[PDB]
Design a protein around this nucleic acid. Structure first.
Lengths: 78, 105, 99, 92, 94, 108, 81, 99
DNA sequence: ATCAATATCCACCTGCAGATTCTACCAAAAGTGTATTTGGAAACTGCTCCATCAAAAGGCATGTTCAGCGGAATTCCGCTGAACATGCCTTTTGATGGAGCAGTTTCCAAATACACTTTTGGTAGAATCTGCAGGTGGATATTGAT
DNA sequence: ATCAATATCCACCTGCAGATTCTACCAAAAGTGTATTTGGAAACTGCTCCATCAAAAGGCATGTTCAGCGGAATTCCGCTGAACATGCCTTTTGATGGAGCAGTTTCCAAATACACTTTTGGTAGAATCTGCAGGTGGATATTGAT
């Protein structure tokens, strides 16, 4: 699954980041980062899901999560 | 007549007051705090919309969208700072390429 | 007669292109797959509002893109123009994400 | 499901009567206000607690705003804020 | 004005872990700052937690989630144990 | 004769003081009875965890009285405690001895 | 009170870089450092004093500073908070 | 006596020295003056509990030390061993103090 | 400078997704009038601790000489990432049972609230107590020249 | 390597500040005891909207090739660390006036707490409406090879 995050896409991301050249070793180093990012956020949102005794992670659970990770997001109510 | 009207505001003085109480921020709430706050919120709302509205104009467009709000915010020192830890969905990024990355002559 | 573009010329073009658009850059299904997998580790038989996955992707991309910004800066500090692992490492460290 | 949208829209016209706003845009604008509400209410809560006050008055909102807003922004923010209360007091 | 502190409690606890070890006043000060910080932090998440759910009461349940959200993996693990543990004992008495 | 709540809970920390602070902190309309108990527990646990580690650093420096340096040592040397207090500054705690390799002389 | 930022002598700045594990310092580091410090302080003192004013006091308490520090996400232990 | 340590030998000696201790490294009085000055060309007739002046200094130094590490890390990334202004810059840039 | 293979740009065109003007419904607001209650300003003031000023003195800052190492610039090789064209497998997109999130109601276990009784955590505070900071000599490293 | 110049590590030694210990007043807690209120888990229900299955789109994976980029090696010199002499100004010790922080009593504007009434923002199932996403054409600029 993490491999589903393709080089083409990782490349696209870099590009928006203003990156002109990329060392091959970057795609894997990148996924690890993305994995850790999601784990942190998802762990927190799902915790909110349990506290609310639901089996569905809601956009708000994520929003709250992000807020906690110090990464406020706009466009979903939080 | 409503308090927003007495205050000359477009924002819901009453609602703000209500939300402040439901906030559990303090045991009591001054009569004017809801007013003052409503005032501040409206203002900043106006502040952005203005810039975002200009953003749309420059883009030859008339309906504001995330990208216009992103351009509005990151393009203004203050707003950009006030929202420095905030991420706007579908906003993109300010066009920018490190000089040293451009070809010679 | 074959027309070929020199190294970096297409890249710069891409940079210009993508800094101008805003579409999410990772493919949905793959993403949703990844999220659910990670989450499946925290709790079983879960479900996600479409909006929650979307929130996440929106947030991750913004995250990664910015991280590429600092990364690209660390490369340039090293008088390079090719971002490398060490660059992402350094950035993340100074960010307080690493150690 | 409450939201500032309606008010947001009003303020919009007042500045760009001919400009419109997409759905997503509105949502964001809402997230914005909710955010700033929380931030300002937050510090205003704190200030009172520090001072062993049990009431959050405009006084707090003001100091709170000075603390939360960038230079010039906080300037107008206060002006606007003080106007609203002034105009509000003077009224039957 | 009798300014309160946790220092006597820190001290008890201190004696439990290292019975022959003492603590300087500055150190006690830091320890005091430590406790209040965590207090605020947990109570804070607790606060929001309840709010997010339209609950007017903060319970041991909201402290638990709070501790989970706030503390690093392993610590939370043990935090909950002592936590759940104190509650039940308190609950069984009387 | 009345038994304190901390007592009923098997705790050194103040269940009563805490319950009280929860109310004045105004974090919600009401505070259930378990809240203060549980919180105090957690609080008491955490301070015990750090004091364990601090007193050790104290030991490692032939000292008997813990000082801030010991607290700093205790914390930055423990992964989680260090994470938990990643944006916290302990006055008079110094830093952990650490030098970058490239800065050491010679080779081999 | 005028050039007090120069009270931050080169030696002091070197000592600081040492604790930081810095082995070599360019000559231009010192002024860059004073600049950075000045901003740090201004940002902290500003708020601190804002807290003082709100309390209608003339004296800047250490709590003023403690709260100021916390606002900036630079939480300090050992001075009452 | 014509004895002379090679350059960098003392520096390391100094790093081990200071990283071992905990006292403040900025002259107490000078720092106090700087505080007064700033607070003043900022708001008149103010007073300070010494503890306040000391809180600021403990903070200030903790901040500066922590910064130098990031800086020192940037120099190295650039295969240098001498920190230069551009290093402090990059750190603060990525830190989020100017980026 | 000379094509020319391409990417980029502009003005125009159109239909449809998503914005909008719509009439209705109504519970939840938000406002109004009454009675009760209390937070916290004002004024008097006890008293902590902040600014200040003195004076002695050495820990440190300043300023200089000077040489070597580390930064910076140039050169150059060969490793590898960018550009492509190639082949097609996965993502995207529209359709349908049902898992739940969410609305509504119930009654009790648990949280206010007001009353007394009681124990404890703080502290001025004179007393007592003791880890260790700081001065010390001497046995043991570590550096650097030869 | 041998060796001289030094820094360093270590244990013993003990005045002294900063910590442990206390008698004692004690106001503010914290606890015990009813009386009254209520938040929110439960069980039952319904209609979202979500996971799942199928089909047309539209990337992504791939191997080839070579340009151009990192970094190794070599060099010039500028500049930063070390060492030293000089003496300034921070530090330490103290004593002091008095600013202003902080404790207490008093009482009034403002806030809570219903009660009663009027209003509005949210939602919905409907209808007309519209800004602009892209799709075409043709002119012009950009890039790259010769």
């Amino acid at each position: 699954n993490i491999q589903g995050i393709t080089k083409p896409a990782i490349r696209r991301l870099a590009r928006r980041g203003g990156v002109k050249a990329i060392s091959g070793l970057i795609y894997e180093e990148t996924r690890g980062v993305l994995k850790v990012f999601l784990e942190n956020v998802i762990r927190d949102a799902v915790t909110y899901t349990e506290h609310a005794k639901r089996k569905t992670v809601t956009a708000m659970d994520v929003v709250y999560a992000l807020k906690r990770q110090g990464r406020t997001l706009y466009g979903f109510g939080g | 007549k409503t308090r927003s009207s007495r205050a000359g505001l477009q924002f819901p003085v009453g609602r703000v007051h209500r939300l402040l109480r439901k906030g559990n921020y303090a045991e009591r709430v001054g009569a004017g705090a809801p007013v003052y706050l409503a005032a501040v919120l409206e203002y900043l709302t106006a502040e952005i919309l203005e810039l975002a509205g200009n953003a749309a104009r420059d883009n030859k467009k008339t309906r504001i969208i995330p990208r216009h709000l992103q351009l509005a915010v990151r393009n203004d020192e203050e707003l950009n700072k006030l929202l420095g830890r905030v991420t706007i969905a579908q906003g993109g990024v300010l066009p920018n390429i490190q000089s040293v990355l451009l070809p010679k002559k | 007669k074959p027309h070929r573009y020199r190294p970096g010329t297409v890249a710069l073009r891409e940079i210009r292109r993508y800094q101008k658009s805003t579409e999410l850059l990772i493919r949905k299904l793959p993403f949703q797959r990844l999220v659910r997998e990670i989450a499946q580790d925290f709790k079983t038989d879960l479900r996600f509002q479409s909006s929650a996955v979307m929130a996440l992707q929106e947030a991750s991309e913004a995250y990664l893109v910015a991280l590429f910004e600092d990364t690209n800066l660390c490369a340039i500090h090293a008088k390079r123009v090719t971002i490398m692992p060490k660059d992402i490492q350094l950035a993340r460290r100074i960010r307080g994400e690493r150690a | 499901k409450e939201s500032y949208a309606i008010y947001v829209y009003k303020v919009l016209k007042q500045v760009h009567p001919d400009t419109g706003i997409s759905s997503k845009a509105m949502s964001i604008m809402n997230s914005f206000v909710n955010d700033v509400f929380e931030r300002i209410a937050g510090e205003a809560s704190r200030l009172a607690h520090y001072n062993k006050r049990s009431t959050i008055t405009s006084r707090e909102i003001q100091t709170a705003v000075r603390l939360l807003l960038p230079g010039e922004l906080a300037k107008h923010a206060v002006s606007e804020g003080t106007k609203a209360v002034t105009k509000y007091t003077s009224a039957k």
